[PDB]
Amino acid sequence: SMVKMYGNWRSAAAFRVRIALNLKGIAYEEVFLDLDAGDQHKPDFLAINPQGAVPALFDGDGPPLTQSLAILDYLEETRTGVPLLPEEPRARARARSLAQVVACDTHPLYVPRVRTFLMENYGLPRERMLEFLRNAFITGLKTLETRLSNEAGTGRFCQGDAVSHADLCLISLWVGTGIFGIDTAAYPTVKRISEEVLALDAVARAHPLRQPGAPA
Amino acid sequence: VKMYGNWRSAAAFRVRIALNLKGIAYEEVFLDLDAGDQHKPDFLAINPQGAVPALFDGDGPPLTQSLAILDYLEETRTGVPLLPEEPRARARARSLAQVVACDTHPLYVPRVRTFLMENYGLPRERMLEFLRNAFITGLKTLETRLSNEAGTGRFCQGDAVSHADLCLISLWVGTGIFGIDTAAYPTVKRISEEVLALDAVARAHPLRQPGAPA
Ligand SMILES: N[C@@H](CCC(=O)N[C@@H](CS)C(=O)NCC(=O)O)C(=O)O
Ligand SMILES: N[C@@H](CCC(=O)N[C@@H](CS)C(=O)NCC(=O)O)C(=O)O
């Protein structure tokens, strides 16, 4: 009947997909796992995604899809009304590169399994573990600020004047700066674009703090 | 086409494979990532991330990020397809690729190894536990997915090489380099050997690049 997503309130990866579903007007239901209580490690969920991570997405008949970027492209290829990539190949590649600075080189360094491994494997206290998370955030934010401020492709959004996968990934990082307490004063271009993105109904409705399980 | 690369780099290897498979000539400029060439101002002007690959295609600005580059080559060049036609199949191929390119590889690159040693004072051998765990986690995920999902054929997705296989082999060759036991991943091994048997892949292999050991 309708698209079904396995997600979590806090997850940046689920947030990216949630935004795309809203932007494209796709009706969906979301099942919220508790990733801190280990719902992602239960046999029932491992049957859906052996990786033990969210998001996982069902689109009618067929196996579930995982990995937020792959899912964003799937939605692009199967629901074309509101495109979230430009048409020109260099512009597409830049948007994807910016997206991947976040989705490959930043976010995977601060997910719960990394945070717990640092504590459990090395005996690091949470406070010292967070130095790794902060370094990942700051490294990604500095990269994005430099690229967005200096490259000709930036407009109202990351790439030109249309929302793209880059912006979905950027806002997913930005909301994390709030959640994890990263100072963002040094990234004014990232701030400008993130606030432009967050002003959209489709994005705001998808915000982690509006999902079940969120704190006040 | 001009690529800033490195002999050992898994991400550069992904792109190098695609260039060879598609019949795209390239110049590769080999950075020394132990010497910190990637942190030099001239290179940071090319890629503020201080990472490889970075690719120039004619006169435009450089392109970074191996997956973004793979899609760029798909979209702007002819040569053998490395993605299927049907969206569910494309999504699966990309998801398997991203298990490696997003969730595994970024955890074992030099910058992370260095941060672990310098920030926490971890001995090299203790730091390597982080690298080993990342490999094993990714290999376990790939073995389970590839062994149980109907989409797997001769290759990761069906019977044609795709982005999934380029990322998979980029991880596989790391198992030898970092001494990861692979006995538990026979499906990954089977596919990796099918992939390595392709001359284009074999030519691109890290251990066959200038800068690699004798
Ligand atoms: N690269 C993956 C990220 C998958 C991932 O690790 N997601 C996190 C939440 S944002 C997760 O569910 N982690 C579970 C865990 O660490 O145990 C994607 O884009 O979907
Ligand atoms: N997600 C990026 C990864 C880029 C990356 O981390 N490259 C490594 C080599 S495989 C690098 O240059 N690292 C520099 C460093 O760690 O200092 C991609 O797919 O291109």
**DSSP character string of A33-78:** --TTTTGGGSHHHHHH-TT--S-EEE-SSS--EE-HHHHHHHHHHH
State whether residue B151 is helix, strand or coil. Answer: coil
CATH class given for the domain over B84-214:
mainly alpha
- Which residues does A201 contact at the CB level (< 8 Å), separation at least 6? A22
State whether residue B158 is helix, strand or coil. Answer: strand
Domain A5-81 has CATH 3.40.30.10: yes
Bridge partner list, A3: A28
> How far does residue B148's CA lie from ligand 1's centre (Å)?
21
Integer Cα distance of B69 and B55 in angstroms: 8
Give which of A93, A129, A124, A86 is closest to A111, Cα–Cα.
Answer: A129
CA distance B198 to chain A (A): 26
Q: Do domains A5-81 and A86-216 have the same CATH topology?
A: no
Which atom of ligand 1 approaches the CA of A113 most closely?
16
**What DSSP letter does each residue of A96-124 carry, written as one string?**
HHHHHHHHTTTGGGTSHHHHHHHHHHH--
Residue A162 DSSP class:
S
Residue matched to tokens 């997915």: B145
Choose which residue among B8, B14, B52, B100 to substitute to test ligand 2 binding: the one with the highest number of ligand atoms within 8 A of its C-beta. Answer: B52
- Please report which helix (H) or strand (E) contains residue A32, including its range: strand A28-32
CA distance B204 to chain A (A): 23
Residue matched to tokens 């971890």: B122
Integer Cα distance of A94 and B71 in angstroms: 11
HSE (side-chain half, CA atoms, 13 Å) at B60: 16
Residue matched to tokens 């955030």: A137
CB A23 within 8 A of CB A205: no
Contact A73 B61 (CB under 8 A): no
State whether residue B109 is helix, strand or coil. Answer: coil
Integer Cα distance of B143 and B186 in angstroms: 7
CATH number for the domain running over B3-79: 3.40.30.10
CATH number for the domain running over A86-216: 1.20.1050.10
Nominal resolution (angstroms): 1.8
Residue A211 DSSP class:
S
**Gyration radius of chain B's alpha carbons:** 17
For A124, the closest of B69, B120, B149 (CB atoms) is B120
Technique used: X-ray
Q: Domain residues of chain B, as ranges?
A: 3-79, 84-214
